[PDB]
Amino acid sequence: MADQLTEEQIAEFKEAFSLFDKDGDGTITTKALGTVMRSLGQNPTEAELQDMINEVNGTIDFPAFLTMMARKMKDTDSEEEIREAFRVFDKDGNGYISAAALRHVMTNLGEKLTDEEVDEMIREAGQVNYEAFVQMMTA
C-alpha cells in the first residue's frame, strides 16, 4: 500500500515533482522523470525507467508518480529490516543469542503467542545464532 512511506518524504516529493511539471497541470514528460531522480539522489540506470512506464501518450502525473517510488522504497527496506531486527535481541549487539530468554520473551512480544508455538520455533532453527533464527522466521 502507501503506508510504508511516512509523511515528510511525500512532503518533499510534491514540490520536487511540481517544479518540473511543464504546464502547472501536474503532468510531466517521460524524459524528465530521470532528471528529477538525479535531484533526489537515487540515480538508477536507463534500464530501470522503461519498466516504470511499461507498467503504466506519455503522460505522467503525481497519482502515477507516487506508485513508482513506492515500489522503489519498499524493496530497499524489506530486505533491510532483517538487519535492523536483531538490535534489541541479544545483550551486547553481536550475534550470539542465549536461548534461555527466548523461551519467555516471545510470550509477551505483543503478538500474543502461547508457550506451544514458541517451542515449535526453537529447535528447528542451547544457543542458536542470529542468522539461522531469522532463516526459519522470515520463511
Binding site: M1, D3, Q4, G110, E111, K112
Partner: protein, 48 residues
Amino acid sequence: FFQSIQALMQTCSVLDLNAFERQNKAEGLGMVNEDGTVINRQNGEKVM
C-alpha cells in the same frame, strides 16, 4: 401483519459449516502490518 413475519421467519440463519472455517482462517492472523490493529469482533462472528 401475517405476511411481514412469515417473510421474517424464512430469513433467519442456522449454523453454516462453509462459513465456519472461514472464521477460523480469519482468526489465523493476529495483527496486520505497519502497526495496524485488527478489529476483532467488527465482522467477528460470521456465523449466526
